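Homework-ish question, so no full write-ups if that breaks the rules, but can someone show me the predicted structure for this set?
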Amino acid sequence: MSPFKKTYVLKLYVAGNTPNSVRALKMLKNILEQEFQGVYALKVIDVLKNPQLAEEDKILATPTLAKILPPPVRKIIGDLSDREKVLIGLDLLYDEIR
Amino acid sequence: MSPFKKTYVLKLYVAGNTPNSVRALKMLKNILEQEFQGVYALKVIDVLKNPQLAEEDKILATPTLAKILPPPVRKIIGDLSDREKVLIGLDLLYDEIR
Amino acid sequence: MSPFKKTYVLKLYVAGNTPNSVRALKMLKNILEQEFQGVYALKVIDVLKNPQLAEEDKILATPTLAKILPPPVRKIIGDLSDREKVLIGLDLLYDEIRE
Amino acid sequence: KTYVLKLYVAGNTPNSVRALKMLKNILEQEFQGVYALKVIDVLKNPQLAEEDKILATPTLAKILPPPVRKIIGDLSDREKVLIGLDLLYDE
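A: Not a homework solution, just the prediction itself:
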């Protein structure tokens, strides 16, 4: 809870939020903050609200990074990408968070 | 130094559109083919209508890449990003012709 | 190669150097400068010399990350990975050019 | 599910080889079924598989059990053979 925890940040860029994706993102969050405490932190970017990428941000196709993630995580990302159709892409960066 | 005679692909990833972004993108296409004799090829990707990015797609921040593009292009890209609020990011790819 | 400046760094992690890989890397460095003038920087990490990865460093698979690169870049990366067999993997990230 | 700790090393040395064996035994006696050890010598198999990833030791190191974090420092800082690692949640 600070002074700033260093960890990888899994960033999901979504096209809006639906009842389903909200629930899925909730689950994804519990997974990372338990099964992978200190390894991965979740960061969600809604392009419907904040479309402009910051100078140091980037989006890679879901299938490109999804492959290297844990089974329970790939499942949820799969649901968000090919079932709900809200996932545009993702990124995985080491960074300091609170 | 390296290869000779290249062709470029200017990819613009947009969060939907507005009556003006459509007009502005039409203008950019016009300019690239005219003023810049088909040097670049334009590709507009609306990720709101099509969130599932191609396995080879990557979206970079407008600021990082815009700076190396023709002045008039930087101008339009700026309008789509700061005025229309539809430009998420872009990518520039190239290949060799001969 | 403007040090102490952020840009998209294409990091190539190799296991050794061969005549062909060395020439290929210099060609890669030149093309990135030619076409993207500053927007991209090449950083090669040889694990036979500097095995310990820096904190922000990560290595992803060639067949996974290489497809998002320009075809002539992909071509050189393909050679390094399947011909020369020196490429372990790579990454693409906005980072500082040379500490 | 079991965790699979992957250690990517650049070759071996009498000491690192000894440290790895120690790590293995400690995981098997203290954290059996919990953590599994897998060692990849990139010098024998340089090309990473499509689903693999090597992360810098420092990030993941801090979240492993004290004894494990210890042995990882040896491989990394003293033997200087450790490139990075990854923590798999098993298939």
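Now go work out the reasoning yourself. Hint: Chain C has one domain: 1-99.
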